[PDB]
């Protein structure tokens, strides 16, 4: 009867209006006679509005529709590691079935006020600019934002690749299992990304949740939440997860599609009234849990694509408001040869120094000051006006620090290698080097330290802290190399 | 003599700079008018779309 | 067969009532017999009370409420295979070259699912176009997806025709050209040029199939001709197992056409009036154009940019779908620097040191650094002029101006109206020339010598002429 | 029931009537109301019809009876319209009695496809030195005229219309070019004065005027270009050559925006509907040259666009630019310096190009486009000292620019354009005072017309300069400049 | 807070963050309910919702409810309807500025945009008012001269202008202060400066008694005593 | 105020401020679902302030010689006088006293910008 079944009244543009289904729960998963599934978003006095997870060609008026009782849930567990799955956890890599430790609903309430703990562990990205100036802590919600083709995905992918060092180790507390959510991307791009991950052997600890462009709007909508549920298994079982949403703008566009086709009242820029709710309930699921809760964590790296650098837009403003920090990428810096083109002025991390490797904190403390001064000094000097000698020296320092932060794609640096470079730059030892040669200096300097001073690198890594003796030895080595 | 020449040259250089600044002001005044009209139209379209449902 | 009656005719939208117990599935093709022949409607929605709403493939003028509609029982279907080569296909899949029927053994629906994730294949092979700016700063990928972005009057058609001339004549594999809301004049010009050059051969083997839904057509036809072009290219890809070229000028018209009907379909308008379904319509058309393990498809898509606004939803949505992009700009065109490609907004995933080589990557990166440095200074140069710059800035601006003019190139297809003979420049020659320019070897040459010359040898020769 | 061929008006407002009945009405069918005002059946719906009113809605009241015409909106066409001024629906408004019609043609028709067409290979000689030299227009071309208000757009179009006198008085239908001028949104007094201007120059006997003046209801302004194109298509389809000027398509776009918004269709960019592109394209695609199988007729279009603040990047301007085969950009910065017709030769382009140009002009006008662009380049930084080469460049540019100035309503034939451009390009003007260049032309042509009429006749008839004719023209130029 | 005020007679502090969230949630609920959106999408009832929230928070004759309200400013735009509506209800505004922060001058309050109802000579006394007014004049003159200094530097300015600009820079850096909470963002021990000492210090700096002190001695120090101590430490 | 005006007395009315009245009228109109306009204000918002302000008048001797002076206050966000309501009120009134924050910070208080401030009735009203 109509209690557990219904009749399709209308079909169009991926929406079905269904009569009956009296006992259906809001957002319950529904199955049409033709086999395609849908999700009952609208409950109304005489209708159910169901958004289809497939082609509406299959559904046609008069078709019988069946409840399921299941609100949308997805498989979770370590068996997904190395797999590529759709928004509902079905494998699409073409390998065998997926073993799962359990099933978890898509929307789940974020960890409350009580169980959390203050973020203190670092997410070592291996990018000099990020680790030095905008540190990312485990449990932090760090926004990556910028225009098209500026380097956002490159930054996230370098962060993912850098975790090889610890994912190979025995210490389960240092590991970081990665989930990459491709929303609206074309399938060939995800194929190239998995090719990159397997080429660098980073796939054995990664998970890909793909809702590509051709996927019906509901799956592009629902992929971030199911990927969050997938990472929350690691979070809740005492393990550490990093989830990259690439990118939330296309999820917002998909929700605009759904809401407008359900004829819900639009908001600004025709987005639905509650996109902020959408992204806030997604991002608040990242947390660092207390010792009672097994000390697990989930770290989020949302990606946002601005149009013409306009952050005042609705969705960019919302996500900037939600997240704990921003890594602004800018095309003008990209074409000046700065790579990964991070705008170190606009970029901020609110956890900041509380979640930074202590040695890199010790050496990097002054870096922000020099760069902040350099920006204004360069703005003045670009006009060609006469210059004071000390101001000229601030130009000398700032240009070389800017050159020092350049970094080739897919080449992350261990902090044992980041510390000497930032030390040399900050303490002025680079002022005598030709600006063109800084990229050579780095490449040679590390090769020197790994040969003549390997003990320094070993101590910097294992201790994580520069004692006075280690700092003096680093000074000695830096001056020794600069002499030669 | 060099001082007199330099003062006259700086006078003429600032005259040229003022001409160029005026031309840029005209260009960006036109651009400002265009952006003003576009902003008004787009926000009004958003309001109308919100009203017409 | 299932039959019904027209009940509402609005613009390109026709509502049909099927009092029979069964209704046609969505995307089905329906036929109305008319004095001109037949009018094909495509089912877009089911409205209830046994009514469906459909998009007309031709003018609805002359329709009367009550006209009998017959269901064809399947989607719009078009001829496929080699019998389509050397011919012009209408949107609904009919010959309009007046050379009689198309005798293909098969006809396939224009709507099909995109290839799965497991079917994707990833090439990393450079396609040499012979164009300095493209070959240097944004190399094209063989088997990849290529896009031209540009407003009106910047010359997208000339660029597309130069690409066809340079590539399609030597690709070996079959080609398909889809006109989606472009000029009928230029489709005629393409057809004539292909006949004269033997790419189309009425007496024998032909290697290009033409599909045209040009801009005179109703929105219903423009919204679907791209899928016919695809459906032919997909048959060449998957069934004939060939490599394929797939040109689409102008794919933006596919999106725009949908908007034209969206308000009539009853949807709530999206931003700036676009249809809510923009992203998913784009996805369903677009990542169906892809290389797969069965065959290789190189696709070149011209994307119009309304009011030169690259932030418009359609170009912005299209940017994500492409491997290589070249962005023609009016600001460059006004300088007379044709092909007007913006060297700091053209982008390509193949400009990678592992793909182009370290030398080419270094040359391209330094060229872009010089151009960006020059662009940053244009406020000071505009107000204060060159004199107040530092000597290093003056040298960099000189090299930037010379590089700007050196990136210009005369295409053969433009010779009709430019009067300048066409030049083709090899990839190695382009890299060597720009490497020489950045090394300052030609700092003495006046910048005028670099304008509209195919390579550094022609720069030297033109400098000699300017000296006499 | 009588509701089959008639209907009862349900409602009236915003220029739209809702009618009950008219069961057998065709979409876009023309209907007649009780008061005699006419409308077009835009929307057919279950139980009602939407009628767009080609007139003031005061003329229609609820409860009136409406009658089918049985005909899609159509206008009379034929040679009898020559010399007539007609409204958007082909009714005579000059007051000279009924129109004589060879037939009737629908306002909306699909432009001829790819196969029927031919490449443009014949010139539309405008009689303007700058246009005929630097941005030639061919028969079957669709060339945009674009620029600010009062920059001379209508002057260019009307000079092109007037120049056709010398051939329309001839015997060969292959040379005659019949001109349709479309006034959309223009002041009625302006159209009346334009008609008088044509009749003064005797250009009316081969021209047709279609007018939808500013006060006329928006649907008429929207419709007028389509019916004028239908009128020109008769000449096109009967092997005769026609020229149609749309002045302006921007005001047609404004009228279509009015209709769209009063129908409450969603506003798009700049509040225009998304359909506006399809408004112009299906119009401007009707300008074509047909193949020999089709009788080789052609219809040439010169759309006129008014750009606020000089924006060629605006929505409607870019739409039309993306539809036409070229543009003639008229620049205020030049017009108010007295540089008239004020062609911006840098942004003006004809992408049919040399195929349309007369070979004699293509010979003498060699690289003049490039030289004038070069002059606009070198002259920019001239105000670091001028090298003698830049001084020569500035002399050439100054003097060629002074030579390209032209008085309104003074078309100048190819046999008269060729000697002047020859003298300018080959440098014989370098030594002549530029303030006297306006004198130079008047004298030089006169000299040629008295001493060298044979050379002008040969330039006319051959359409080419042989080395003998080239050398004779050179000798005459040197003889005059020495004189 | 109201129960503590009206039924216990207490003086109450009502800390609120974030008021922008109240406005934004009102906008979301309004949009969901189908009300026609107002400018930039805010709800029609924005002003009256804010009034109903705010002017319940007031000092009745039973007790006083002090409130500190953190207001997020989207896109740093103080003209956005939410901050613009909030401003009208406040007695003292402490406008944090990104520009001041990028100079490194924390806590990065904008010395000019921040305003108080109580900065009146009848409330704080004429000496405090005079010092505050002179500080505002000095900082505003320095801001006005920056537009020229960005082109011609300080060399072209008159000696009076040079002196006032230098004192303005010293004052601008002297407004910085090390908070205790900031000891994770800084190693500097936090300090708390009395109002009387603040007035005395800024009067001393305005009068030029410390013209001989380098600018950096004023950065992130406490009272003027810390200025002297740090100046000696640098020397 | 019109009671004083009509009975031959002189009155002064200060509206503090009309921007918030316009906001309240926008609230009423939008919640009544009357057609919006620019900045979502109702179409006839000009007719609000013109209806309100034109009641300020100086009456002739026959009509009682009374008067009603009006000092409407207007708040400009970021100093933008091009906004809809500032434009309407500037159009309706006889002049403006323009206060600028830049002058207020400099210590020029009551911070009247003399260049922008104009009284079009002007000198006729001034004390000789
Ligand atoms: N550090 C780097 N050094 C050199 N090239 C880089 C670097 N980071 C990114 N790139 C290049 O910049 C281009 C853009 O990179 P990427 O794909 O990560 O950008 P994105 O912002 O994610 O782009 P989109 O919006 O297209 O998804 C690619 O060519 C990438 O190779
Ligand atoms: N070749 C010319 N020589 C001299 N004056 C000219 C010339 N062409 C145009 N003018 C002047 O320009 C005035 C306006 O010309 P015209 O009517 O062609 O301009 P328009 O761009 O069509 O204007 P509108 O926008 O008002 O319709 C003419 O009255 C005449 O004064
Ligand atoms: Mg990316
Ligand atoms: Mg005109």
Minimum distance, in Å, between the CA of residue C307 and any CA atom of chain B: 12
Residues C15/C52, Cβ–Cβ less than 8 Å: yes
* CB D221, CB D89: distance < 8 Å: no
The strand pairing partners of E233, in sequence order, are none
Q: Say if CB A400 and CB A438 are below 8 A apart.
A: yes
- Which residue is associated with the tokens 């020999």? D292
Residue B50 sits at the chain E interface (C-beta within 8 Å): yes
User: According to DSSP H, which parts of C320-425 are helical?
Assistant: 330-334, 353-356, 358-383, 391-407, 415-418
C-alpha neighbours within 13 Å on the C-beta side of residue A122: 27
Contact D396, D375 (CB under 8 A): yes
CA distance E102 to A344: 11
Pairing of strands A64-66, A5-12: antiparallel
Ligand 2 atom nearest residue D410's Cα: 1
Q: Say whether the C–A interface has 3 or more Cβ pairs within 8 Å.
A: yes
Name the D residues in 137-166 with CB < 8 Å from any C CB: none
CA distance A194 to A157: 11
- Considering only CB atoms, E28 lies closest to which of A273, A311, A321, namely A273
CA distance D457 to D468: 14
Cβ atoms of C194 and D298 within 8 Å: the answer is no
Q: Do E155 and A386 touch (CB under 8 A)?
A: yes
Question: What crossing angle do the helices spanning A248-261 and A314-322 adopt, rounded to 10°?
Answer: 120
The CATH number of the domain covering residues in C76-350: 3.40.50.300
**Considering the domain D358-483 in this protein, what is its CATH number?**
1.20.150.20
Q: What is the spatial distance between Cα A144 and Cα A160, in angstroms, rounded to a whole number? A: 14
User: Do chain A and F touch: 3 or more Cβ pairs under 8 angstroms?
Assistant: no
Instruction: Provide the CATH number for the domain around residue B45.
Output: 1.10.287.80
Q: How are beta strands D144-147 and D298-306 bridged, if at all?
A: parallel
Question: What's the distance, CA D253 to chain centroid?
Answer: 16
CB D313 within 8 A of CB D320: no
Q: Report which of D347, D366, D360, D383 is spatially closest to residue D144, judged by C-alpha positions.
A: D347
Q: Report d(CA D412, CA D474) in Å as an integer.
A: 20
Chain C, 370-409: which have a CB under 8 Å from a chain A CB?
A: 371-373, 376-377, 380, 384, 388-390, 393
Tokens 């036809």, residue located = C221
Interchain contact C269–B (C-beta under 8 A): yes
| Cα(D334)–Cα(D344) distance, integer angstroms | 8
Q: What is the C-alpha to C-alpha distance for residues D399 and D368, in angstroms, rounded to an integer?
A: 12
Give residue E230's Cα distance to chain centre: 25
Kindly report the CATH number that applies to the domain delimited by C351-468.
1.10.1140.10
Q: Report which of A411, A342, A341 is spatially closest to residue A162, judged by C-alpha positions.
A: A411
Name the residue among E87, E75, E97, E13 with its Cα closest to residue E50: E87
CB E108 within 8 A of CB E96: yes
CA-to-CA distance for A86 and A211, rounded, in angstroms?
6
Residues having C-beta closer than 5 Å to ion ligand 3 = A 153
Residue of B nearest to A270 (CA): B46
Nearest protein CA to atom 23 of ligand 1, as residue: A149
Total Cβ atoms within 10 A of residue A424 = 26
Element (H, E) at A52: strand A48-52
CA E174 vs. chain centroid, Å, equals 14
Question: In Å, how far are D156, D180, D209 from D200, measured between CA atoms?
Answer: 18, 17, 15
CA distance A205 to A174: 13
DSSP letter string over E191-227?
----HHHHHHHHHHHHTTTTTTS-GGGGTT--SHHHH
Contacts of C395 by beta carbon, 8 Å cutoff, 6+ apart = C443
Annotated domain spans of chain C: 1-75, 76-350, 351-468
Main-chain dihedrals φ then ψ at residue C100, nearest 5 degrees: 95, -175
Instruction: Name residues whose C-beta falls within 8 Å of residue A251's C-beta, 6 or more positions apart in sequence.
Output: A183, A184, A220, A221, A223, A224, A245, A278
Exposed e or buried b per residue across E125-134, where buried means at least 16 C-beta atoms within 10 angstroms of its C-beta: eeebbebbeb
Can you list the positions of beta strands (E) in E112-205?
115-116
Q: Enter the tokens of residue C436.
A: 């020489």
Q: DSSP secondary structure string, E59-124? A: -BTTB-EEEEEE---GGG-TTSHHHHHHHTT-SEE--B-HHHHHTT-TT-B-TTT-EETT-SHHHH
How many angstroms separate the CA atoms of D109 and C216, rounded?
Answer: 10
For residue C213, the SS3 value is strand
SS3 category, C274: coil
Under 8 Å between Cβ of C313 and C132 = no
3 state DSSP class of D53: strand
| Residue F66, phi then psi, degrees to nearest 5 | -70, 175
CA distances to C30, C72, C386, D258 from C1, in Å: 11, 8, 79, 44
Rounded-to-integer distance, Cα A169 and Cα D114, Å = 68
- Three-class secondary structure assignment of D313-371: CCHHHHHHHCCCCEEEEECHHHHCCCCCCCECCCCCEECCHHHCCCHHHHHHCCCHHHH
Closest Cα of chain E to B41: distance in Å?
Answer: 13
Location of each CATH 3.40.50.300 domain in chain D: 72-357
* C183 in catalytic set: yes
Residues 6 or more apart whose Cβ sits within 8 Å of residue D345: D130, D134, D135, D369, D372, D373, D376
For ligand 2, atom 11: residue with the closest CA: D152
Residue E166 — φ and ψ, nearest 5°?
-65, -45
The CA–CA distances, whole Å, from C84 to C29, C100, D177 equal 21, 12, 41
Q: Which of D58, D265, D351, D436 is catalytic?
A: D351
Fold for the domain defined by E119-235:
1.10.1140
* CA angle in degrees (0–180, nearest 5) for A129-A132-A136: 95
Fold annotation for D1-71: Elongation Factor Tu (Ef-tu); domain 3 (2.40.30)
Query: What tokens does C163 get?
Result: 């690409």
Euclidean distance between CA atoms D435 and D439, whole angstroms: 8
Strand partners of residue A43: A48
Q: Which two tokens stand for residue A19?
A: 């009569």
Give the total residue count for chain F. 128
C188 touches chain D (CB under 8 A): yes
What's the topology of domain A1-70? Elongation Factor Tu (Ef-tu); domain 3 (2.40.30)
- The C-alpha of C274 sits at a distance from chain B's nearest C-alpha, in angstroms, of 12
Residue C409 structure tokens: 């190139």
Pick the CATH number of A357-484 from 3.90.1310.10, 1.10.10.10, 1.20.150.20, 1.25.40.10: 1.20.150.20
- The CA distance from A38 to A52, in Å, is 4
Distance CA C24, CA C14 (A): 14
We find that the CATH architecture of domain A71-356 is: 3-Layer(aba) Sandwich (3.40)
Fold of C1-75: Thrombin, subunit H (2.40.10)
Dmax (CA) for chain D in angstroms is: 90
The dihedral through the CA atoms of D110, D113, D117, D123 has a sign that is positive
DSSP letters spanning B1-53: -HHHHHHHHHHHHHHHHHHHHHHHHHHHHHHHHHHHHHHHHHHHHHHHHHHH-
Whether omega for the bond prior to residue D119 falls within 30 degrees of 0, making it cis, is no
Which ranges of A284-437 would DSSP assign to H, the alpha helix? 314-322, 331-335, 358-364, 367-381, 389-404, 415-426
Report residues whose beta carbon is within 6 angstroms of any ligand 1 atom.
Answer: A 148-154, 305, 339-340, 407-409; C 349, 352
CA of residue D228 to ligand 4 center, whole Å? 18
HEC string of A230-299? Answer: HHHHHHHCCCEEEEEEECHHHHHHHHHHHHHHCCCCECHHHCECCHHHHHHHHHCCCCEECCCCCCCEEE
Q: Which residues line ligand 2 (CB under 6 A)?
A: D 149-155, 306, 340-341, 406-408
Question: For residue D246, how far is its CA from the centre of ligand 2 (angstroms)?
Answer: 16
SS3 state at A190 = helix
Alpha-carbon gap: B44 to the closest alpha carbon of chain F (Å): 6
3.40.50.970, 3.40.50.2300, 3.40.50.300, 3.40.50.720: CATH of D72-357: 3.40.50.300
CA distance readout (Å), C231 to C93, C109, C239: 10, 7, 11
Can you tell me the distance from the alpha carbon of C142 to that of C298, in angstroms, rounded to the nearest whole number? 6
Q: Is position D265 annotated as part of the catalytic site? A: no
Residue A151 CA to ligand 3 center (angstroms) comes to 7
- Ramachandran angles phi, psi of C175, nearest 5°: -125, 150
The DSSP code for A358 is: H
| Integer Cα distance of D37 and D19 in angstroms | 14
F81 lies within 8 A of chain E by CB: no
Q: How many angstroms separate the CA atoms of E33 and C20, rounded?
A: 41
Backbone angles phi, psi at E162, to 5 degrees: -60, -45
Closest CA to A242 of A161, A341, A131: A161
């Amino acid at each position: 009867n109509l209690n557990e079944t219904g009749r399709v009244l209308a079909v169009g543009d991926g929406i079905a209006r269904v009569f009956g289904l009296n006992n259906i729960q809001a957002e319950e998963l529904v199955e049409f006679s033709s086999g395609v599934k849908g999700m009952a978003l609208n409950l109304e006095p005489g209708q159910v509005g169901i958004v289809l997870f497939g082609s509406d060609r299959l559904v046609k008026e008069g078709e019988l529709v069946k409840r399921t009782g299941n609100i949308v849930d997805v498989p979770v567990g370590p068996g997904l590691l190395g797999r590529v799955v759709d928004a509902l956890g079905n494998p699409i890599d073409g390998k065998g079935p997926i073993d799962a430790a359990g099933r978890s609903r898509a929307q789940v309430k974020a960890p409350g006020i009580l169980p959390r703990r203050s973020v203190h562990e670092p997410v070592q990205t291996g990018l000099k600019a990020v680790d030095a100036l905008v540190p990312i802590g485990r449990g932090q919600r760090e926004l990556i934002i910028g225009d098209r083709q500026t380097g956002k995905t490159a930054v996230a992918l370098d962060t993912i690749l850098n975790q090889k060092r610890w994912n190979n180790g025995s210490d389960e507390s240092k590991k970081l299992y990665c989930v990459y959510v491709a929303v609206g991307q074309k399938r060939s791009t995800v194929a190239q990304l998995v090719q990159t991950l397997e080429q660098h052997d980073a796939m054995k600890y990664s998970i890909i949740v793909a809702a590509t462009a051709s996927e019906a709007a509901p799956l592009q909508y629902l992929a971030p939440f199911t990927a969050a549920s997938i990472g929350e298994w690691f979070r809740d079982n005492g393990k550490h997860a990093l989830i990259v949403y690439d990118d939330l703008s296309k999820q917002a566009v998909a929700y605009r599609q759904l809401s407008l086709l359900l004829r819900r009242p639009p908001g600004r820029e025709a987005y639905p009234g509650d996109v902020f709710y959408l992204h806030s309930r997604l991002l608040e699921r990242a947390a660092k849990l207390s010792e009672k809760e097994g000390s697990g964590s989930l770290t989020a790296l949302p990606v946002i694509e601005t149009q013409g650098g306009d952050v005042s837009a609705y969705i960019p403003t919302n996500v900037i408001s939600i997240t704990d920090g921003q890594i602004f990428l800018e095309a003008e810096l990209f074409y000046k040869g700065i790579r990964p083109a991070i705008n170190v002025g606009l970029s901020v991390s609110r956890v900041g120094s509380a979640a930074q490797v202590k040695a890199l904190k010790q050496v990097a403390g002054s870096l922000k000051l020099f760069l902040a001064q350099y920006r204004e000094v360069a703005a003045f000097a670009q006009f060609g006006s006469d210059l004071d000698a000390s101001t000229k020296q601030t130009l000398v320092r700032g240009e070389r620090l800017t050159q020092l932060l350049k970094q080739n794609q897919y080449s992350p640096l261990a902090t044992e290698e980041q510390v000497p470079l930032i030390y040399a730059g900050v303490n002025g030892h680079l002022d005598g080097i030709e600006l063109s040669r800084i990229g050579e200096f780095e490449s040679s300097f590390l090769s020197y330290l790994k040969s003549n001073h390997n003990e320094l690198l070993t101590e910097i890594r294992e201790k994580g802290e520069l004692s006075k003796e280690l700092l003096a030895s680093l000074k000695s080595a830096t001056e020794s190399f600069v002499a030669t | 003599q060099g001082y007199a020449a330099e003062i006259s040259a700086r006078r003429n250089a600032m005259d040229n700079a003022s001409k160029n600044a005026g031309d840029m002001i005209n260009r960006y005044s036109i651009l400002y008018n265009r952006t003003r009209q576009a902003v008004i139209t787009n926000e009004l379209v958003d309001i109308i779309t919100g009203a017409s449902s | 067969p299932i039959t019904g009656k027209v009940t509402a005719v609005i613009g390109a939208i026709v509502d049909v009532h099927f009092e029979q117990s069964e209704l046609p599935a969505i995307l089905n093709a329906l036929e109305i017999k008319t004095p001109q022949g037949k009018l094909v409607l495509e089912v877009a929605q089911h409205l209830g009370e046994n009514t469906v709403r459909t998009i007309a493939m031709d003018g609805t003028e002359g329709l009367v409420r009550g006209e009998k509609v017959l269901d064809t029982g399947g989607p719009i279907s078009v001829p496929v295979g080699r019998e389509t080569l050397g011919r012009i296909i209408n949107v609904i899949g009919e010959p309009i070259d007046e050379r009689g029927p198309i005798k293909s053994k098969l006809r396939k629906p224009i709507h099909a699912d995109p290839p799965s994730f497991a079917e994707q294949s990833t090439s990393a092979e450079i396609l040499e176009t012979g164009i300095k700016v493209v070959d240097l700063l944004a190399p094209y990928a063989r088997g990849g997806k290529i896009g031209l972005f540009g407003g009106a009057g910047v010359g997208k058609t000339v660029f597309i025709q130069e690409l066809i001339n340079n590539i399609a004549k030597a690709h070996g594999g079959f080609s398909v050209f889809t006109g989606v809301g472009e000029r009928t004049r230029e489709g005629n010009d393409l057809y004539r040029e292909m006949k004269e050059t033997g790419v189309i051969n009425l007496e024998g083997e032909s290697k290009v199939a033409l599909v045209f839904g040009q801009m005179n057509e109703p929105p219903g036809a423009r919204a679907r001709v791209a899928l016919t072009g695809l459906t032919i290219a997909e048959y060449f890809r998957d069934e004939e197992g060939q490599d394929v070229l797939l040109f689409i000028d102008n794919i933006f018209r596919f999106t725009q056409a949908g908007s034209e009907v969206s308000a009539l379909l009853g949807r709530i308008p999206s931003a700036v009036g676009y249809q809510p379904t923009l992203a998913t319509d784009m996805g369903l058309l677009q990542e169906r154009i892809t290389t797969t393990k069965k065959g290789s498809v190189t696709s070149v898509q011209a994307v119009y940019v309304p009011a030169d606004d690259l932030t418009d939803p359609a170009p912005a949505t299209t940017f994500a779908h492409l491997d290589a992009t070249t962005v023609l700009s009016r600001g460059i065109s006004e300088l007379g620097i044709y092909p007007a490609v913006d060297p700091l907004d053209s982008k390509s995933r193949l400009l990678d040191a592992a793909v182009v080589g370290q030398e080419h990557y270094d040359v391209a990166s330094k060229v872009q650094e010089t151009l960006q440095t020059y662009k940053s200074l244009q406020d000071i140069i505009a107000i204060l002029g060159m004199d107040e710059l530092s000597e290093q800035d003056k040298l960099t601006v000189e090299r930037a101006r010379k590089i700007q003019r050196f990136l210009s190139q005369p295409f053969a297809v433009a010779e009709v109206f430019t009067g300048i003979p066409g030049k083709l420049v090899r990839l190695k020659d382009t890299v060597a020339s720009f490497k020489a320019v950045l090394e300052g070897k030609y700092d003495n040459i006046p910048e005028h010598a670099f304008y509209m010359v195919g390579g550094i040898e022609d720069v030297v020769a033109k400098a000699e002429k300017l000296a006499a």
